[model samples]
Target: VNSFSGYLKLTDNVYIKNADIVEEAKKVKPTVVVNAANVYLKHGGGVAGALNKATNNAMQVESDDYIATNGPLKVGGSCVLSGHNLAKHCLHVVGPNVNKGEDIQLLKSAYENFNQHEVLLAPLLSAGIFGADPIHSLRVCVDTVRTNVYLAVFDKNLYDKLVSSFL
Candidate 1:
């Protein structure tokens, strides 16, 4: 278990890592796979609720030895599911469902905690990045917060890229 703070960027439209996730996805024989957008909450997936449920499930699944929850956060744990073994250790900070100034503080704290722990992964982007979209509060929280310097986007395309890059 080597925990190091490393930063990488995804700028090239065509990355080797991106290509791999796509190829693996193609190999899977299925009529149609569920899109990640369902949980985007634009239509009402409720980011706060989903974070709560996911934390609840993870806590329940990994009980006994060491199951710790930080209000809406978890750090230094492994996902029992075998597939995620190769994944790096992560610190997940689940923010509140408010559109106030406090969310900004929470986002900042999450970043600070990750920096202190030296846990490298996607920072606020995993939560949501604001650009032209109208969720100003959430956008502000993500963009202004600098918790995850080495952000990683783990969609189907990114997955394919990583798999192809090293495996």
Candidate 2:
């Protein structure tokens, strides 16, 4: 799969590729993959939808249990779940439902709080049906890292946009 890349100040090796996220995850064999979730830990749509279904809802039960104690999370809040498939863990973050600029800040918070080792494969959070434009959302994800982030874009137009913007 073809991709474009950018240098990240906080860590080494950040890339945006055009491929399926699950397929990319399998290829990279990252230690953790990120799941964009809601307050209820419901992984029924978007990337979350794909992941939970892929793993037979293995992570959701744990995610639900986490929400049970911590209460419903606000946008930018997060929880980590043990992973299946190619990853060893999954970091689940509650993302924004609207694209009100603060979603970028919310993405920042999500990235800042991420504590893990090796690689992390993620989708463009808030960039799909969630309402944020893919270009802006990807910029937020790439720009707000405490460490490197790996992402895949399934949409050709979005991939082209990122490549043209950075490379």
Candidate 3:
């Protein structure tokens, strides 16, 4: 995977991982393990990796009927791919390739697709999929969360849900 850029972007000036979201959310472990495997791909790296392992790992004991969230490899509780079990369940949105800037509606569509395909993971099928700048992709990716996520993070910005928090 690309090295962790010091910053991430979505739209506008949302670059720079100066915010607490990336730092904290990445390190804290959640008390509950939400099983939303139905939302992500079977081989997503970070969060997906953890989720895959968590659900399938004999060591983990995740319960069914819970929410799943976060992208593969992006979840986990430490450096370079940690913090899968840090939230209630990761809001798994698996597409747009990071720079594609997918909105929440598309993210929802991804979940629906997962349901339809009975195969988690919304392919990174963005029109610009093959032409994204690596850093720009990460920045745009983390920034687009405003459009795809409706929940809180392990940071102070959380408000029952990120939507109401913004409003």
Candidate 4:
């Protein structure tokens, strides 16, 4: 299982930890767990699957219901809903598909749109699976949040990059 290896302070309100969203969400009991969601908002595998398991599949239910009510989740757009008892409100966001030549603005939009909420258990947006380089993405990601932030960065290298930005 992926456990938190090192936890440190990024700021008075911002903290950094090498933890997955599943366990990290519990660490802070964040009102919202921001998973690295796909365009469809489906928790198929990877980060999404883990969040799905942690939320007792409640993540998928809300995501599906959200689509049925609204339409396919568009890139840079977000929706909110209840997660399991653990997650007070789950924030689902669709990031850009870099391979398709989607611009960085889309990813930034995903962050700025959600930054309005407080106490977010946020992920390293613009992750590699979508072909967004960690170093580049971490730039916008660093300033994306306003305050009361707890970051769940899953990789040690990514954690290092984030640390660089803060320092």
Estimate TM-scores for all models.
Answer: 0.34, 0.81, 0.30, 0.83
In the range 1-167, model 1's lDDT, one tens digit per residue, is 32222223332211112222212223332121111111122212332223224344442243222224322122211122111122322233433323322233443433334334322333222233321122332244344434333333334454444434531
lDDT of each structure?
Answer: 0.29, 0.70, 0.30, 0.72
Whole-model lDDT for model 3 versus the true structure? 0.30
Candidate 4 C-alpha lDDT tens digits along 108-155: 888875667866777767685777876666566666767555677788
Top lDDT model: 4
lDDT of each residue in 1-167, candidate 2, tens digit only: 32324422222456666777776666666777888788788888788888788788877777788778888877887777787875788888776778444555576676654545445677777777678777777666666664556777778787877777763
Candidate 2, lDDT over the whole model = 0.70
Candidate 2: segments with Cα more than 4 A from true spot: 1-13, 99-104, 115-118
Model 1 whole-model lDDT (C-alpha atoms) = 0.29
Report the C-alpha displacement of residue 51, candidate 4, in angstroms: 0.2
List runs of model 4 lying over 4 Å from the truth.
1-7, 11-13, 164-167
Q: lDDT, candidate 1, residue 104?
A: 36
Order the candidate numbers by TM-score, best to worst: 4, 2, 1, 3
Off by over 4 Å in 1: 1-60, 63-84, 99-102, 123-126, 129-148, 154-167
Poorest lDDT segment (10 consecutive residues) of candidate 3:
118-127
Output the better candidate (2/4) by lDDT: 4
Q: Could you tell me how far off, in angstroms, the CA of residue 77 lies in candidate 3 after the best superposition?
A: 24
Best by the TM-score measure: 4
